[PDB]
Design a protein around this nucleic acid. Structure first.
Ligand SMILES: [Mg+2]
Ligand SMILES: [Mg+2]
Ligand SMILES: [Mg+2]
Ligand SMILES: [Mg+2]
Lengths: 63, 225, 386, 136
RNA sequence: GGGCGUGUGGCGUAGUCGAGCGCGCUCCCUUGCAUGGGAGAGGUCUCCGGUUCGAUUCCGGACUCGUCCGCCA
RNA sequence: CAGUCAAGCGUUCAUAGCGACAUUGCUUUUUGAUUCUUCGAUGUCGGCUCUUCCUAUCAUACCGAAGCAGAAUUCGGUAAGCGUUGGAUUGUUCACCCACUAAUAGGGAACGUGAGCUGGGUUUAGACCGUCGUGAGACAGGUUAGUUUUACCCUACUGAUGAAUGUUACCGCAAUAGUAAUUGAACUUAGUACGAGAGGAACAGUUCAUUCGGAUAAUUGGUUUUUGCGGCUGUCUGAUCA
RNA sequence: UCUUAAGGUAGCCAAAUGCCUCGUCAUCUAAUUAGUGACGCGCAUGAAUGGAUUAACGAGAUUCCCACUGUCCCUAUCUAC
RNA sequence: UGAACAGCCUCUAGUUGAUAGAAUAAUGUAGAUAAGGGAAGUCGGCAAAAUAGAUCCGUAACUUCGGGAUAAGGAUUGGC
């Protein structure tokens, strides 16, 4: 199997878990759950959502 | 020979097969006649690999191949990649491509020396083609057809292009590729010639509905005699 | 006049009446056909439904488009402690059917099985099978005359077995007792096997093995009184309907001047005993083993229990059967797993199955992690961890 | 589908009933396709015949070029936008409903496809896979 | 749906079993408020079978058109 | 709707398929005829919903015949097990088109079904037009607006208890009653059999699908009084916190 | 030219007025007994029985389009009583 | 608060009356939400949804020149 990464939060996606979304510009996004999927549809920036891997990488948290 | 073959009724052989000088690729869900054509014509000198690309029977439109290298999309699984690595000779290089257009047989029309690509490919993918295939690359369209792999059939000796192609585009592409090109049809008038047939230096395989003048044009332009 | 447009009948008439079951343990109405050549073995087993999870396996179907490719499938887990053999019974065959003639019990009966014979256990002198154990502890006098009676008569031998409810996380303390048919050897060999196995435990791998197609017999989940729209699946009446719209409009013609039995009406939904056939066993797990949830490809030592335990059930410290798909009944319910009544080839019942990965994430939410070590490695250190 | 099917298709969750309007992905000059029928659909009282990805439908061009309007023609669904499950268990969906025009044998009226197509459609129709830019 | 009758040249129209006239225009002759005259072309008689010796004609079938009568509370 | 006879049609040949002139029947899903029951009222269109029955079988199963070479088709037998659709117009039944399908067969059950619905039509009282009439008014002529009541009883049906079989508990047997699965596509057989060619099968095998049914909730989606967490408006607790 | 007092003028129309009738042609739709525009030997239109036209207005009648949605495919769930 | 004797909250004043208790089946009455499609439902978009205040831009045919018109159609809005 392959373990994919969340396109919004960077969480690990196990097989059969979450959803996938193909945008009209032929780019693939993978969501681990409806929470990150709905935040993506609400167009929030993952750099400003405090629990995401990209936020913690930006803010040097836990280093 | 332009060999008459069907894929279970399908007269498009370039969709389900990829033929180069060094290897051949065929789909796993194929008939005995379809395998027997490649087995008899190619012989034991050239390996024939039954493969699946990205879980799809279509392999010719998904992959772009060369005698030096093979390009596969990102969606190709590790089991398929390892099976191709074992089955293929050590000379060829297999490298995954991470690119949005992702259907390399449609995107890329290539031979041993020179290649035509889709105009809008990424620069990293162009450099990856030039590295792995060792092939000089041009971004060009065949009379406004961006899918140069589907709308051109190319080999070392010559090339077949789309029938509704401007003549000025024909000498421009011929001078750019350093091979003679003929506008013609395959499979009783189907426009998609690259999807219609596969060709290499000594063999061309086409659909059963490809007529005799079309087959004569094929053997004339590809010098298979 | 005739019905204007044809449509199929709503519901199945062969599952009638849709009433509550007589007991919470469904009856095994038929056992596999005996042949007197195989060794003596049970025909069925008892377990408790624990819950469901997913697996990933590589499909082997030579001709499918998903041949030699990974698929993810839903399996359900049945917790099966080793069952305890107490008692055998023999059945003679009469022109009015099968009839039991004697029942010979084991000597020492545990408290969890003799709680089955009581409604008020806490106020009792616990006098059960006391004079029967007094019939024992002689040499043999009142015992092998009934055993030789079962040998001389009794064309069908069945074994009384009972679960070990105290090994499960259930709070019941009162075991389930059942009859399981023996399907090997002669009548004397059957009763000799039973006599040797009195007061002894039989494990689940002695009766089941992998890639075996089995049947699940259980009582379904109850739902109480239900209207006709969800109980039978009839079409909802339009919005501007006076006096309600979750109904059947015409419940019969003028003649015959009675409501027919075939007309869908409201009543009890669920809690019916069902037998679902052809479920393939993917794993016969051992409870005396770590890395139950590990496969040859995963190879991380984790048990079959998910994070936080099975929801509403608990732990799987005993042996278990991983079986493909859905079985009737909800969690914490007794379920009888039975061998197949016929030999199925089908190129699907003969498929050899080897698992790749088993899901052990939490079912009490959108679980991200399979093991607490993986969760700690991903999240780093927290405030509560010093 | 029916006649021009290259193999079989697993059941995809039906997302396009009769009366649905989808975008017209090819370069044939039509803008949208209006679904009036699904090939191979069954019969049930009150149930609308619905289409999924890779299905062949009967459609009319509601908006587009006047030589394409006001007539029925076969079409092939290439983008679904209602989420469906594969046998590897990913739930996936596009962001719009889209199809292309074809004859009853399945070869495309147009020549190029804009945007992605599904692999369950590209495997089933080779001409769509021939003119398709990206297959996901 | 049924009944009854109808079908001719480019147009209208005459036909007892043995396709004519008029109108359109082809040509020629003839002359304000533009005529007349003379030779022209023009049909598978709605179509298909049988009778006769030969059916526009008699009969049978089909097509087409036009009339008349027709559901419920 | 079904027979009997057979002058003829069918190149030849009554009966493969038909069949004139005659003649024997069946049915009560047509419309009449009659007035037996109901006028101290049995709710008269159509549709929606739902069950069951009939066979005079449209499809599916197995067969017989052909003016059956193959493919397609036609006639007939056992057969009612199983299915018989989505729409535009019209209040409609009916009809007529579009389209899918294996097929889009015909009917009954107080012209099934209004204390099941609806109220478009018809069929009150308002109003307009045309025709008729001096007029009041008339018109299965057209148009528009027009209250759809009651079940808590008995039976029936669906589910639920329960006295009495010395008491109580556990494990069982099975009389009787019900019953369920259905249809298609693709690959291959095979461009094979057959045929002069055009054309072009079938059995076995494999992978899927349609309709139906019984469950189930690992995943995905839906649902939110977990008023669980966060945010936001207005006001009130002097502010803050809450 | 008859008949009669005089013979339907200007306009309008399968119109809320046309039996035949689902009139014929065009358009609208995949498909329209609906709608609109034309035509008129109009059963039985027509001039203060008022004719034709008409901006604005209408809890009036009818048709189409965009948006919108549990009206529907096909149902599911929640709250109060 | 707000344009406002609108709606919502509060002060003075006045009530705290309407048989209650326990559970949360079906069918109701009233209030709601729904993936994908978007009137395919129906006699008929019935019912519901969508739109909504204010500022700026822009506004057709037709007309009795007064209107149509908030036509249609776009953008913005908090706190400091
Ligand atoms: Mg009826
Ligand atoms: Mg019927
Ligand atoms: Mg859960
Ligand atoms: Mg309906």
């Amino acid at each position: 199997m392959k373990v994919e990464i969340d396109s919004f939060s960077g969480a690990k996606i196990y097989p059969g878990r979450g959803t996938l979304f193909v945008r009209g510009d032929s780019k693939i996004f993978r969501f681990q759950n409806s929470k990150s999927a709905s935040l993506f549809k609400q167009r929030k920036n993952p750099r400003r959502i405090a629990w995401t891997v990209l936020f913690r990488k930006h803010h040097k948290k836990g280093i | 020979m332009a060999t008459r073959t069907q894929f279970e009724n399908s007269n498009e052989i370039g969709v389900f097969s990829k033929l180069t000088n060094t290897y051949c690729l065929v789909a796993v869900g194929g008939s005995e006649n379809f395998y027997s054509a490649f087995e008899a014509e190619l012989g034991d000198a050239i390996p024939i690999v039954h493969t699946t690309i990205a879980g799809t029977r279509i392999i010719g439109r998904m992959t772009a191949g060369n005698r030096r290298g093979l390009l596969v999309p990102t969606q190709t699984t590790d089991q398929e990649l390892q099976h191709l690595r074992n089955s293929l000779p050590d000379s060829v290089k297999i490298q995954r491509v991470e690119e949005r257009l992702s259907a390399l047989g449609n995107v890329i029309c290539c031979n041993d020396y020179v290649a035509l690509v889709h105009p809008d490919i990424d620069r990293e993918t162009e450099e990856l083609i030039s590295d792995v295939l060792g092939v000089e690359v041009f971004r060009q369209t065949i009379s406004g057809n961006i899918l140069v792999g589907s709308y051109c059939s190319l080999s070392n000796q010559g090339g077949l292009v789309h029938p509704q192609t401007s003549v000025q585009d024909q000498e421009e592409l011929s001078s750019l590729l350093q091979v003679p090109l003929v506008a013609g049809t395959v499979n009783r008038g189907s426009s998609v010639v690259g999807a219609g047939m596969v060709v290499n230096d000594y063999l061309a395989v086409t659909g059963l509905d490809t007529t005799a003048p079309e087959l004569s044009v094929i053997e004339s332009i590809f010098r298979l005699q | 006049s005739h019905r204007k447009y044809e449509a199929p009948r709503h519901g199945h008439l062969g599952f009638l009446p849709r009433k509550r079951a007589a007991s919470i343990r469904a009856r095994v109405k038929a056992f596999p056909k005996d042949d007197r050549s195989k060794p003596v073995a049970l025909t069925s087993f008892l377990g408790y439904k624990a819950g469901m999870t997913t697996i990933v396996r590589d499909l082997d179907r030579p001709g499918s488009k998903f041949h030699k490719r990974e698929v993810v499938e839903a399996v359900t887990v049945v917790d099966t402690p080793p069952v305890v053999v107490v008692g055998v019974v023999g059945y003679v065959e009469t022109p009015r059917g099968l009839r039991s003639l004697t029942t010979v019990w084991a000597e020492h009966l545990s408290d969890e099985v003799k709680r089955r014979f009581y409604k008020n256990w806490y106020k009792s002198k616990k006098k059960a099978f006391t004079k029967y154990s007094a019939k024992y502890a002689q040499d043999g006098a009142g015992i092998e005359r009934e055993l030789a009676r079962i040998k001389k008569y009794a064309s069908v031998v069945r074994v009384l077995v009972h679960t070990q409810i105290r090994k499960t996380p259930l709070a019941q303390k009162k075991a389930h007792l059942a009859e399981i048919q023996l399907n090997g050897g002669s009548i004397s060999e059957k009763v000799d096997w039973a006599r040797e196995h009195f007061e002894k435990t039989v494990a689940v791998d002695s009766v089941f093995e992998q890639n075996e197609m089995i049947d699940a017999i259980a009582v379904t989940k109850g739902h109480g009184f239900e209207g006709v729209t969800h109980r039978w699946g009839t079409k909802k009446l339009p919005r501007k309907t006076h006096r309600g719209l979750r109904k059947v409009a015409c419940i019969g013609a003028w003649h015959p001047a009675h409501v027919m039995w075939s007309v869908a009406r409201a009543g009890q939904r669920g809690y019916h005993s069902r037998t679902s056939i052809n479920h393939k066993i993917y794993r016969v797990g051992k409870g005396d083993d770590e890395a139950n949830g590990a496969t040859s490809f995963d190879r991380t030592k984790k048990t079959i229990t998910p994070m936080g335990g099975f929801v509403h059930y608990g732990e799987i410290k005993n042996d278990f059967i991983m079986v493909k798909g859905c079985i009737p009944g909800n969690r914490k319910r007794i379920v009888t797993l039975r061998k197949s009544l016929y030999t199925n080839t089908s190129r699907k019942a003969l498929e050899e199955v080897s698992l790749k990965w088993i899901d052990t994430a939490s079912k009490f939410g959108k679980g991200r992690f399979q093991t607490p070590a993986e969760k700690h490695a991903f999240m780093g250190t927290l405030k509560k961890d010093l | 589908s029916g006649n021009g099917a290259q193999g079989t298709k697993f059941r995809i969750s039906l997302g396009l009933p009769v009366g649905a309007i989808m975008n017209c992905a090819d370069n044939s000059g039509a803008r949208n396709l209006y679904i009036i029928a699904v090939k191979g659909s069954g019969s049930r009282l009150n149930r609308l015949p619905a289409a999924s990805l890779g299905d062949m439908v009967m459609a009319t061009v509601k908006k587009g070029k006047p030589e394409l309007r006001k007539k029925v023609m076969p079409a092939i669904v290439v983008r679904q936008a209602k989420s469906w499950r594969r046998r590897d268990g990913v739930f996936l969906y596009f962001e719009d409903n889209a199809g292309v025009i074809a004859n009853p044998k399945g070869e495309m009226k147009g020549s190029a496809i804009t945007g992605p197509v599904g692999k369950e459609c590209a495997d089933l129709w080779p001409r769509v896979a021939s003119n398709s830019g990206v297959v996901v």
